[PDB]
Design a binder for this molecule. Sequence first.
Ligand code: FMN
Ligand code: FMN
Lengths: 361, 361
Amino acid sequence: SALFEPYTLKDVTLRNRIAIPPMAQYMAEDGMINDWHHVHLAGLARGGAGLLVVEATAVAPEGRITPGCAGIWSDAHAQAFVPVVQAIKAAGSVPGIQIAHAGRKASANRPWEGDDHIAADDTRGWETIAPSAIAFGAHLPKVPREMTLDDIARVKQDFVDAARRARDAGFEWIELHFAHGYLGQSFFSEHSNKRTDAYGGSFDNRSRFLLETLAAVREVWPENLPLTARFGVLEYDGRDEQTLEESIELARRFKAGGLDLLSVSVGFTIPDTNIPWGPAFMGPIAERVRREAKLPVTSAWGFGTPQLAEAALQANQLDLVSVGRAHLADPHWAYFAAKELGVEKASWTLPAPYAHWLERY
Amino acid sequence: SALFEPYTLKDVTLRNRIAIPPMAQYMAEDGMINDWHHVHLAGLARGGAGLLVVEATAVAPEGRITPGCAGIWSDAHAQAFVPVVQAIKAAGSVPGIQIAHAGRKASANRPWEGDDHIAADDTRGWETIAPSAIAFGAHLPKVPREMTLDDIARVKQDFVDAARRARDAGFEWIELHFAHGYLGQSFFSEHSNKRTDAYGGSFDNRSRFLLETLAAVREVWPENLPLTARFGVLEYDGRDEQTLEESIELARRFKAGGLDLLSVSVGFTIPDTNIPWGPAFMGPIAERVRREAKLPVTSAWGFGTPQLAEAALQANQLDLVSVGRAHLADPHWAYFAAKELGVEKASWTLPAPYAHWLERY
Ligand SMILES: Cc1cc2nc3c(=O)[nH]c(=O)nc-3n(C[C@H](O)[C@H](O)[C@H](O)COP(=O)(O)O)c2cc1C
Ligand SMILES: Cc1cc2nc3c(=O)[nH]c(=O)nc-3n(C[C@H](O)[C@H](O)[C@H](O)COP(=O)(O)O)c2cc1C
């Protein structure tokens, strides 16, 4: 099976091609993770996936999506990850982390607590920042504050400090969250970036925040550990061919700037779009980015059907398959997939205290 | 669904009828549990089962099955359970523990490390104790030492101390391990108990260790928390009708002595038997014990098919359904079962950070 072949990137080897993508848990307090995250993550690592990417972790308090988001904006925040990292490694999975800044989509309620911007008089909320003072709209109506150049410098440095902290906590894989309409994606998109300084207008200017952040992170992140990003390459907004072309060009610049793999997603920059949801619908777009930028990729959405994950790898649409919700349903999805795809000794996808009893079960 | 109806016993209410039976992990060191157990147990509790019974936990070092068995023979051993108990409760499951003494089956290798008695010159091994100096045979050839009356007094007191420790660690449910050919089962069975003192010969004498242990435990275990035992009620050794009759009589004495529920099993006292394995094969025998002793019961073996669990409850064969290996395969089995049985809002069997995303998934 292609799904169960190892993958090496820089000095890191994944035992198979199953990646658990970042999935926000909304269970942290003042950015500090706790035993929710410890058990959730260690349990996933034991399920067999080759790579486990920790949820969007804010580089600064105002860059959380919600009051429940994880943060890494102080050394004490970083040190809370150390035991979790150590547990993921003990289980044989590679520990990764997505570092993030939610931009105009920040200061929102948890998804099961309204999913909308927090009310102005709610003591939990805060002012959001973005390239331009333009609201997302719909359930996220707050107009963000337009960033100053000093704000841009500060947020870049927050990404650097977050990457340095992630390194020192023992993570072996980092992902810059430049997707899903958050700060980085919103600098790239003409929908959200109306700046007239060096950080908006042209393709080079809209790319600038993302490229400078990548380069600044690269100074502290070890050259021998994968340096990755997640990026929305189209919006399904009626501008797809033009947007894809620019996004692929940026992917080429990321590669030239030391990016090892791109997690290919949709932008979600604005609400007025028509996304053609379906199982593995991202496969063809990820394949095009992979081919045209000559860069390894992962993608997600509906790969919890093991045969679809297998087909995507065999077609060279993807290098890793990211499987999200199926891992919430069943932390041991990798074992399920191994059985489905007829892997020999499938139960030994799991550790011995499980595997021994499930042999031919 | 019957499977998803709550159950109250003494002051404890289980949110559904799914019990996770004790399942040895073989991951402790000198009896001390560690982050293996913490994550394993907290993850199971979050999967939705109403009751989670911690694995066979030795009341004394020589009562471990193997060098990897959990123990509770000192206060430091007990205190290692406190954070795990607290995590199980946080997840809404009832924390239970099975306290145990492996008797003649002690001093064995882990199941994936030979599964047999440890060699005489292996520094990990130890002398086993039992009612009589008679080996199990087959892969457990060691002849145990015949217990003195002082040994019997000491082991009873070890059970008392273990129950007191379990209480003080915050467990809400206790199970005495009188099944599976370990010490208690071996006092009851004429195959293994050839004593000619007050602890062997007659039905009353063979029952005596089990009844005295129960009564001594009852002095320290709170009257408002379920007091349970696991007991093998037949052997499939060609003596089933006679053995069942005696076992049911002992179950009546257990009930009279304050036992709240009996986990009904097979004896496994000797190797030369013919067990008719099949899905839910224990259902009819558990039903007979339930009816003839007028005592609530659980049983196990093949109830990971949700419809079978449901049918057993609806037929009043069982009060709780114990589901073991299916929970090793999938810690979230309860969610799978809820979907299968058509429970409304099945995903909310899980906590919010999972349930929200799996609604209609
Ligand atoms: C609970 C949940 C939280 C998510 N949080 C993040 C996140 O922190 N960062 C991110 O880039 N994507 C996030 N996503 C998107 C997932 O990484 C993934 O792309 C998506 O769930 C599609 O894959 P699936 O169909 O396998 O679930 C989240 C998705 C879910 C279900
Ligand atoms: C990994 C494993 C360890 C077990 N350890 C114990 C134990 O500690 N105590 C006990 O009484 N039974 C033990 N058992 C038996 C289980 O509690 C249960 O009765 C059996 O697995 C049948 O249920 P199932 O078909 O749902 O797995 C163990 C079973 C397994 C698979």
